[model samples]
Target: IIGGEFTTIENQPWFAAIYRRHRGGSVTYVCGGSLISPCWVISATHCFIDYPKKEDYIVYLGRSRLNSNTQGEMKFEVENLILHKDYSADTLAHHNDIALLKIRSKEGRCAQPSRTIQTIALPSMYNDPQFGTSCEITGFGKEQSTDYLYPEQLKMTVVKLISHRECQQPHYYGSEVTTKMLCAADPQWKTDSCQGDAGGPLVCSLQGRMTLTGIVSWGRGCALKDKPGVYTRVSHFLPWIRSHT
Candidate 1:
């Protein structure tokens, strides 16, 4: 998870619940997600679409505990998934990694109030070039992990926006990184996304509502000094997203 400082859910349970799981199995393999509507979820495309089978994945909502053995309810399964056509895992061109999912009950029922799945709004205009704007990141990924998965109970952090020119360093330029596809975060190494956090939402508030700005794309490593994490800019995919939805 990228952006926002560390804090416990008891003091911020609503904030904690915003981050969700992609596949239904282990918390160790969880991904990031945001409620985009009463029955829709917004997440990174690589989280589930890259897999060979869509059935292999599930979207879980409305839960604070990863163990699922504690309090609160857990809504499992997804009714449909829409991945951007430009998404390509082989090159890791996560520029189009953003995806929208329709959530439903395990029995293929429509979402209900009890389920608690909600949608987060997309920014109506490009807010970039407004570098250094504060944003929030959340995910089930680890604070630190050896494998490519996340830990339990969603994690979060704060980050500042960086210019596209600053984000495309010599090493990243002409490779998987491109100004047309990605956005940069604060240069601070300690503030960024890790494995299992991919495909999560980078959010900021506008007009009294939270708006999704980017989708976690790629990074050399979590909190690598001087290497800011990259995200697929949502504004670039707005038309395709609207067509798909």
Candidate 2:
């Protein structure tokens, strides 16, 4: 995956683009998201600081390249912002770092079906991926990112889930990693999500379909040392997900 080199997205059709627009008409990529349904996308809560204004969010799907009008790309306007009430940047622990975005067309219709755009199935209680399971994460963020460098094309990688006990080692996330969070990393492959990937999907295969297991939330800086990347554990937030979507 240079887990950074260009990767085909045919199998990951639900990967979404989260764009932030400033008042001056300039725009920037903030994070990634997974289309859980035509109208709903799941992302990290930190993607929106405080509450993003209407101009602050735009969802684009079926696009493999950033800032480009890819052939099948469709841009959607955000209809609502629903951040988990418990999310607090001040806490520094990234607790409940998940959010769902509702989207609609400029014409006020829900996101429609298309060849390159579709929804990824959400993981149910019985479908949860346990420890040691390997999963894939896709994003258009920078490759070999150094705390900066936004890449133009999407990249992907398969990373194995590190057990909570090992993830708590002093060299890793330490006490900052909570039950609400999950860790993933592998020194052998050295692949992990970086800038512009937060709020993206960490999907595990469950029999036939890709299952949404976690949301890219935090990390020390891409892949480094034994400090594995952290995510908002989907299993820990099923009630919040079911209640909202």
Error (Å) of candidate 2 at residue 139 is: 0.7
| Clash count list over all predictions | 14, 1
Q: Give, for candidate 2, the lowest lDDT window spanning 10 residues.
A: 1-10
In candidate 2, what are the lDDT values of residues 136-211, reduced to their tens digit?
8888776775535677778888888898899998877678888878898875647888777889889998767788
| Residue-level error in angstroms, candidate 1, position 233 | 0.9
**Least accurate 10 contiguous residues by lDDT in model 1:** 11-20
**For candidate 1, lDDT tens digit of each residue in 54-131?**
455565555555565424445556667777777675444555677777767677664443423345677774554367
Stretches off by above 4 angstroms in model 1 are 2-30, 50-52, 89-92, 107-118, 125-129, 145-149, 171-175
